[PDB]
Amino acid sequence: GCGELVWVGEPLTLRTAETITGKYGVWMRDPKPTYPYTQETTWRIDTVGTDVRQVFEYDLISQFMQGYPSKVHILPRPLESTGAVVYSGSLYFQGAESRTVIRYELNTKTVKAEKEIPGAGYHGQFPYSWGGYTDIDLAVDEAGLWVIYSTDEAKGAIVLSKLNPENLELEQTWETNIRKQSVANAFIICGTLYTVSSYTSADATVNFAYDTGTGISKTLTIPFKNRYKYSSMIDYNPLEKKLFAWDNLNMVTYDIKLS
Ligand SMILES: [Ca+2]
Ligand code: NA
């Protein structure tokens, strides 16, 4: 069931990158898996550098945690930053040095859709507080695919839009009052956007919420620990009902509780 976020557990480390290429990155699973993948399939992208194209795919959680990839994809266009997601068989990622979101179908290794996010800042205009060109952050929740960004019209406040996952059309858009560059990252649970206060602190918080169903903004004080002091990626997986994050070489997960 759905509800308001009221608690975040301790970070559990599932895998640690062994080279600087993985200081920051994104790892994820598909909340709507489709053949030939399952809910165990895991994708990992080490995102340090300027020509990021390698996506590590693991059929089994055991492989993700202890072994080599079962397949490596080479994306047809380099990828920007840590905001990508996998949803219903496709990797949704941002093209390097662009405001373009690309739908890359994993089974066929084929680009199925591309869309400029209208007005979105990119490449260091509205990053989260750590930088990293994190201007555009994709999200999956219980209702499907979203994108988190900002625009000049919004004066850098977080904007979020629901996306058509087939053709990337924007279906609805909400504007918050939260300065995107003032928070460490964000994610969406049950239609509510949440932000994290700090990417370095062991004593950070989930500090703001914006409910797209009611339009109401709130402050929160839910503890959030950056165990390794440099969180580059914090997303929510609605199938596992957990946070997935990347913290200074470490792929970590957090349990949650909803009201
Ligand atoms: Ca995020
Ligand atoms: Na994301």
Residue numbers in the entry: 244 to 502
What did the published study say regarding this structure?
Inherited missense mutations in the myocilin (MYOC) gene, within its olfactomedin (OLF) domain, constitute the strongest genetic link to primary open-angle glaucoma via a toxic gain of function, and thus MYOC is an attractive precision-medicine target. Myocilin has no known function, and there is no glaucoma phenotype in Myoc knockout mice or in individuals with a homozygous N-terminal truncation mutation or hemizygous deletion of MYOC, but rare non-synonymous coding mutations lead to toxic intracellular sequestration of misfolded myocilin. However, not all mutations in MYOC cause glaucoma, and common variants are expected to be neutral polymorphisms. Among the common features associated with pathogenic myocilin misfolding, we demonstrate that a single metric, OLF thermal stability, can robustly segregate benign from early-onset disease variants.
Illustrative of this latter group is E352K, a variant documented in gnomAD as appearing predominantly in the African or African American population. E352K has been computationally predicted to be pathogenic and has been documented both in primary open-angle glaucoma (POAG) patients and in control groups, yet exhibits WT-like secretion. Modestly lower levels than WT were detected for T293K, E352K, K398R, N420Y and A427T. Structural integrity was further confirmed by high-resolution crystal structures, which were solved for 11 OLF variants. No gross changes from WT OLF were detected for the structures of T293K, R296H, L303I, V329M, S331L, E352K, T353I, K398R, A445V, V449I or K500R, indicating that these mutations are accommodated within the native five-bladed β-propeller fold and do not perturb the dinuclear calcium-containing site. Similarly, the finding that E352K does not exhibit characteristics of misfolding is consistent with the later age of diagnosis of glaucoma for patients with the E352K variant and a lack of clear Mendelian inheritance pattern. Most of the patients with E352K are of African or African American ancestry, a group more prone to developing POAG. Our findings rule out misfolding of E352K as causal for this higher glaucoma risk and suggest that other mechanisms are likely at play.
